[PDB]
Symmetry: D2
Subunit: 125 residues, 4 copies
């Protein structure tokens, strides 16, 4: 089950850490933090996933957002990740992300970074 | 205030409709639907925003996700929007989006579309 | 004809100016400059277009690159535009772009901006 | 030197093959083909690179375009890659790409895919 396979802890290639609960009606809730795992680097995340009949080994589409504000930092920024969960002994969440910074109208052209990250169940290094 | 300016109804250039509540601790909750506004085309959205001291007329960074599953449709897909809110008599939310479809491993190269949309407070046409 | 409709001068929403020649074997060659049109702001561009039988009023896919180095500036950056030409009395080139800056390995996460621009045949303002 | 380090053959993670010449005045010219290396899968590429003083081990920004038309195929599409070259015994070109398909006005929302690819000097597998 998708809900089952998604819920838990995921690590990117730099061991940033994604702790998520997949709810029965499509909610993703959790925390995004960085490898050393201090509250200083922990942020709320919220998103959604689209569970659908398991055919052709298709991944499960999902997305989430982190606003980069906690009790220690206010980066005036938010990232969204869009991707898919694929289950199995080598389960992965493959994503592309957008990071937008709060900017002036004149600097808004330069407000949005794009990148990618791949999450697995095993902490690297 | 950001929380105040964001909460409400927003329309893209095609009159797709975004109904959001901005919570005090950074949550975005609401519905994303399309112009004719039938429940058939209404989906849950969830996201986050980063409120920060109003300086240099900087926008407020935010993001949200829609998983394209409701009681009428299951598109096996999710979109994330990343952008910024700018307030005023011509308030806007400027976004870039990523749409990921659930795909096979062989088709995963072609899983993610990118685009943009601008939301305003006034319904077009 | 595509080759015919593309060749010439195009303007974005800020009147940045794109002067292109579409070659018979798919080449795009020209200059990208900014509204005031000084050599100081003029850069070489090169790209490709895919001419294909005119069916269903489909656009013509194309792309180009500008490296942000001329005799006046070296921004250590390059932009690529990917989009499509659509002909007619309101001809347009609709694009999405990626801007990459030369960065350190530690800063490479933050190396690539994304945006969009729409070009028309008529100089705005 | 940048011009020297870039010119040659590069392979992505699937062994698609990028054969490029970096010119003295910033041109990239070459062929993009797929692992088996048949003319059927070989396409022209053209782009630009921004050589700049070697400081802080910064990469060299570059971009290129392939229109997906050759004597065997006309995919009505073009891809642009935006990224940076980093030299050394483990030289790499890290990219993000945009693929645009020629579409109708109604389907133009869904015209552009985004992804990433990393090129190295050594053919995988």
């Amino acid at each position: 089950r998708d809900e089952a396979g998604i819920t838990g802890t995921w690590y990117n290639q730099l061991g940033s850490t994604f702790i998520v609960t997949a709810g029965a009606d499509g909610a993703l809730t959790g925390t995004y933090e960085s490898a050393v795992g201090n509250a200083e680097s922990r942020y709320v995340l919220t998103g959604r996933y689209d569970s659908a009949p398991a055919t052709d080994g298709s991944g499960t589409a999902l997305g989430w957002t982190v606003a980069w504000k906690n009790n220690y930092r206010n980066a005036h920024s938010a990232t969204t990740w869009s991707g898919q969960y694929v289950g199995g002994a080598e389960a992965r969440i493959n994503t592309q992300w957008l990071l937008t910074s709060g900017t002036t109208e004149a600097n808004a052209w330069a407000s949005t970074y794009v990148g990618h990250d791949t999450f697995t169940k095993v902490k690297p290094s």
